């Protein structure tokens, strides 16, 4: 392997592939896969949020209540999200939720705040 997959997956995705190849090693090493069903929430706008997520399958919706809930995008392999708990206040600020089987590979707060955090796609985000 899983390692040499997430290797070779993580070498694929435009904002990871500007990383040093040890550190992306060192995410190899940590990140854990989990999988989703269709309809599952991944993450509940106002929960409290310590983990980015990187699609590695699958494709998911982001809503966000500003009554109900609005569509805001889809998102799918090779794109990620959460990393606006983990950029100052850990609130979660929207809902992502899975539509159909989708693999994430999830970094929890240390690897991020020390190997993701600093990239400009990431840091400089805006929706
Ligand atoms: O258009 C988007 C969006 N598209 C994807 N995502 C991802 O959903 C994740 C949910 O968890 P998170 O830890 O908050 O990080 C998030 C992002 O990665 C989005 N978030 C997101 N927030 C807003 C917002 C916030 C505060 C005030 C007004 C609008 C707009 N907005």
């Given at each position: ?6 290797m ?5 995705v435009?904002?990871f ?12 090493d ?27 399958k699958?494709t ?9 809930p ?8 090779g ?16 809902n ?11 970094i929890?707060r ?11 796609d990431?840091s400089?985000?805006?929706?």
């Amino acid at each position: 392997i899983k390692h040499t997959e997430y290797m070779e997956f993580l070498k694929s995705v435009p904002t990871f592939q500007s990383l040093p190849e040890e550190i992306l090693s060192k995410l190899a090493d940590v990140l854990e896969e989990t999988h989703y069903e269709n309809g599952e929430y991944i993450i509940r706008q106002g929960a409290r949020g310590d983990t980015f997520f990187i699609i590695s399958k699958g494709t998911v919706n982001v809503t966000r209540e500003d009554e109900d809930p609005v569509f805001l995008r889809t998102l799918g392999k090779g794109d990620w999200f959460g990393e606006k708990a983990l950029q100052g206040e850990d609130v979660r600020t929207a809902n992502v939720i899975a539509a159909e089987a989708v693999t994430c590979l999830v970094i929890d707060r240390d690897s991020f705040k020390h190997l993701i955090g600093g990239l400009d796609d990431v840091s400089n985000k805006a929706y």
